[PDB]
């Protein structure tokens, strides 16, 4: 009996638990995707590889298994590579699998069809990259790519399959023996007791301790241990954007609504899978109070992240589950409690800030402003705490992050570390496919334009996605003009563009709403029915910042 | 009070325990090296940066602290980068620090003095690379370089210091607060009990178990735990080249002299800091018996090393110290012992091969052969078990590895994973500088030519190095000729070259020997006196392999 | 009849005029070098690939045909790559040919012998790179490499030959038809008449015109046209270092001895194969007088060199031969003459500077200084105007460049654009091999250490090289000390090292000299006899600058 490279690739993926392939067909991988579908894998075909890649990336975040993006050679590979780079930047496990052309023609730069040394091009832009020349090495190649994607700091891996590989024929028994079911692809890594003891001694010296939960903490799926660490220590916490919901955002220990005071006045800060990068002002400047006022404890699987920005006095290296559980054990044995004055200081700021926002969510101005629209969507998420929220834009992003409380972990998927516009539709597809939950995508109209053709994809697979476009006719605002009076302003779109009518062009439901009540009712009907829906919400073009 | 970039660099290195800088002076780092020496660091200046880089590399292997190599820009940086890449390949911790030119001129490719984007050029060839533009970030830049060099799988890191950096002046108190004394640069990483349990179950099922000790196990400096694992399990072991001496090479559990049988007939193999790369035939082929006859347990800090070549049924990820002690604990609690007939099989094969070799060591040919010369040096090392052996060549390498038993760990420094000719004199310098031990460098005459100029360096610092050149007039052999009769053959050197005269050029002792007894007496005199010595040993040009 | 990869490689090289291979043997190219020698090519084997690479680089400068450097994989390839990058920086045609390992193992990063994707690693560091997978494409691969090396701006090209290539067998007639004898490898490129007209108009407007001859003009081998352009226009000229001797350095139109005045006070400058890089202060600052005082005409084959640093009002793009001849034809038809007052100004400045230098050449100090030693060697070169001068160091370089007049083109080979220490012995080998001329290598003692082992290569091939080491015991000077009193100073060597004894080690002539008369006598004897000779010249350790 004989097998070929086509079947070995699919067999290796199936053996290792891959159930979905995100892709765009074409030479030389169309028949690979057809075979994947015939062998029971779900194959999702997109309108652009970048969106297939974004889907695979967030599938990795949601599941701790590498999402698979399959593309053609050079131009399609480059489209996927952009998403793979973003996956690496965000620590999402993902494998970009791409066909490539004739090795000897490419090696001589003779102008092959879609010629590119895709292995060499990918390496500066992703965590690891491999190329498989022989059918008998497909099993090990897939194993190397899975291990690179999910171990250590997870990230994007490139796997290059030359067209010639797929049609190679080898003995079927030799083939099956060549496959590898990876054992312990993402091993636990436990910290040394001395590192835990040092972290505990710093934490116990704190007068104003603070926990910061990053999306690495959400990714780790150690929800019970993270919640117990916060609740049994009594230490207030601030969630980063995609750690919202790991503990309910309304939790009594959250200082999220008092973030400025917590960051400025704390003295010991425990970072749980959160980098001191631009989102935390690099641990420097007035955001963190006076220089010398902060000691940092940091839990991270990547030892090289310690001392990346400022001195880390108590580095704790290992997987978050192991590290949090070791810390929690120590707190259970010896911990005085968190200082009461500090908690009361933060509770007062939290209540004052919430009270200041509260009237803004109720103001019923016409045109609808960002606050009143998002006040309605806040209620949707409270009523549907298992729904997934996709969110991108500028005002649409920053205001939604502050106003919409999340209640369950890994339900908020947004622009991430690189602040990428364009993840929305790819993320919505993967969220619906991987979780089976309803998806609410809250999109700026500029952000939506980077991936908006994928609404046809959403319709084609009848995915339960409700898209809300905050249509303010522009980037940030819709009011800029050309001072020469000849063209539109550089930051505007066609006024009152009807994105809902675009959705209807592919058979989805389109709604045009102009009030918070209309928005609420339309979202409710979409999420109750599961029908692909796009709601075009008129937002005041002068509202928001900038 | 004010400080400057010059002083901040030296302060940051001193703060983190750097005591030695290997370098070659020149613009823009001559004054940096002078200040290091003025501030009490030992500064070793070489004749070529590649040798200064090799010294730093093996200094990292010997100490588990990054060896520091300091170079000028573009051409000197490239010389050091070749050694940094070799350090990375061998998992040796090392920091290449280079000056670079004017950022704005290099960025526009205008033809600066020694113009090169050294940061961009280094990244494909080493583990990590950083460039420091502002004096206040020197402390963090040094901290990042240190952590990347020694954590995880150790390797070579590039630290780029533009010439303008050194002259920047900042407040001395701000300068001091910006320095970082790295906490736990190389953290312990402990494996999960489930992974150890899996490995123990495989090991207990073995009828013919084998331990392979790689140079990762030697580097880890967990000597007592590694020896206890071998001795208390009773499992025979094979040491890779630079793991020789971790346990005495004459240890009764060593199957090193029955290596071929041990690899072929074992059923369970425990790899301890050793890769299934070309040195172990990729775990494939006749070296390892019949396909499917082997189950591998592998201990390694790098999770991505698992399944690199063949399926690893029991991966154990962590630092070697933590993992071998966890295994040892499990063996102590439940171990039936290694099967006796397996040890008997290997012991018989070991004694038979040692006997086959014994007559070759005493046969006193004329001219001297490799075996009889190396028989004298075997005795030297047996009599001086704390001396360091540097070794490179072809016959001179492979025959010395088999004939010269090592008795203490980390005393054998050789060509390593890339089989590099050229590490000899650099390794000898760092060995002598770092340890204070006598050094015996056993060098092929071709191998020696790659770094031979550094005998002046050895003389200049009065280092206790005894160099033995196995002078067979060529690469592998001295007999090849030009079939056209016009030139020397491509693989020979000047016949009867007297490298001892080259040593005397720099005030060292130079000796010419023709017999094993003359060799033994000359080596004894050199190593007793500690004077820099080069012994030119006349070896039969027709002796050896090839 | 059948042929193989080994033979096709040698056949392709022979077909295109390759007569010499510089190399270091080893797997997988030892048998390739043997076959080359058996088929009549001269094969020069070095002690380190970087020196073989330097030889190939200057062979390209000397001959306008790519020098061939042949190396093993990863570590030897990296050594050669450093010289290939330097060739690219200096615009020297060169091909680095390296063996590489098993493509499928390297592509999976499984740890092949000397594993490296050398194609991908080479590309950021040279002009072009190709890899040849199939024997039938060897002919085209060699054609591609030759064309890339010598066309456009010449430079270094990497040609990768996997080990499996050499033993492929194909039909001998197919093999013969697959070979390519390159037609017009370095085509002439003629400038548009309108660019020449523009340049002539600027030149005719000049009150103080100046020609600058760079080593591109020397490389071009348009000697008669360049000399005619200078002599028939009557415009004074300044030669860059390796354009010295294109016209005799004593030529009445040379302003080389009045360089500062020529650059500062000229108004129109004609660059002929010379970049406004660091060697010409980027066309900025006080070197060039007041801002706005200069108009540049530039002749270069590389259109992208125009406006690299400052605005070029008359760019002329093409090969120097064609462009100089087109300028010359314009001058012959209509030219008023260079203003004779400007020539008078430069003549007076030249005569004053030479008179200020004359006493220092005759000052018979003890110990010998740089000036009195170089005064002797100035006379040597005057008496031997066909000899080749290799020169490197700091004081030994800068003072020799000023003091030693060259009389014939392409006789001065030095550190070049990157200021590399280490080109000396490789350049000397290639000069002697390619030209058959006597070679005088004037070497700093620090500079010599970077390639000094190759004196054995010089002896092995009995090359007419006379090496003079300016032994001042250190870098720039020999007087620096360790302020802690523990070690030698960072910039010194063993005091009164006898490098001449190192030459005796390999059967060459060693001489120690202390006065200019002893030096002159020793050089005369060495260059008269053609015997490989190294003269150790004692230089005052406090003389010179820096
Ligand atoms: N399973 C894990 N265990 C430990 N650390 C992890 C794990 N997964 C990701 N990380 C770390 O979590 C961090 C996430 O940082 P960031 O992406 O900056 O989160 P946010 O943007 O929420 O701050 C990264 O440093 C990554 O190494
Ligand atoms: N402290 C350590 N703990 C665990 N593994 C280590 C440690 N230091 C190095 N290693 C691993 O040891 C291995 C060395 O393998 P190799 O260099 O191939 O040794 P040899 O050449 O002797 O087989 C590498 O896989 C490296 O990741
Ligand atoms: N045959 C040629 N015809 C025209 N320009 C050439 C030719 N060969 C080299 N060049 C140019 O000559 C210049 C040499 O510049 P440089 O190397 O800076 O010379 P120097 O260092 O003497 O100034 C380069 O710009 C290169 O493109
Ligand atoms: C790929 C990419 N391109 C451009 C940007 C810059 N950018 C930041 S926010 C934004 C759009 C903001 O407008 P919108 O989504 O309509 O949100 P609004 O503020 O109007 O609610 C853009 C284009 C980006 N982050 N990513
Ligand atoms: C940098 C580098 N260049 C070339 C080689 C190829 N090579 C392998 S062994 C060797 C020298 C073997 O000759 P020698 O050192 O004299 O040992 P012998 O067998 O003669 O005792 C060389 C050049 C290499 N491994 N590394
Ligand atoms: C590869 C490389 N490394 C380092 C340097 C820095 N450098 C510039 S000149 C010089 C040596 C100067 O000393 P020497 O050759 O003895 O000449 P001297 O002034 O003493 O005559 C060095 C090492 C360089 N140019 N290239
Ligand atoms: Mg908008
Ligand atoms: Mg030899
Ligand atoms: Mg000197």
Author numbering:
A (entry chain D), B (entry chain B), C (entry chain A): 22 to 567
Paste lines from the article:
Here, we employed structure-guided iterative saturation mutagenesis to convert oxalyl-CoA decarboxylase (OXC) from Methylobacterium extorquens into a glycolyl-CoA synthase (GCS) that allows for the direct condensation of the two C1 units formyl-CoA and formaldehyde. Previously, we showed that besides the decarboxylation of oxalyl-CoA into formyl-CoA, OXC from Methylorubrum extorquens (MeOXC) is also capable of catalyzing the acyloin condensation of formyl-CoA with various aldehydes, including formaldehyde. During catalysis, OXC and HACL both form the same α-carbanion/enamine intermediate. In HACL, this intermediate is generated through proton abstraction from formyl-CoA or by cleaving off the aldehyde moiety from a 2-hydroxyacyl-CoA thioester, whereas in OXC, this intermediate is formed by decarboxylation of oxalyl-CoA.
To gain insights into the specific active site topology of MeOXC, we solved the crystal structure of the enzyme at a resolution of 1.9 Å. To increase the GCS activity of MeOXC, we sought to systematically alter the active site around the ThDP cofactor with ISM. Based on the crystal structure, we identified eight residues in the proximity of the ThDP cofactor as targets: I48, Y134, E135, A415, Y497, E567, S568, and I571. However, the catalytic efficiency of MeOXC with formaldehyde (kcat/KM = 2 M–1s–1) is far below that of RuHACL, which is the best performing HACL known to date (kcat/KM = 110 M–1s–1). Additionally, the KM for both substrates is extremely high (formaldehyde: 100 mM and formyl-CoA: 3 mM). In the first round of ISM (R1), libraries of positions 48 and 571 contained only variants with reduced activity, suggesting that the isoleucines in both of these positions are critical for catalysis.
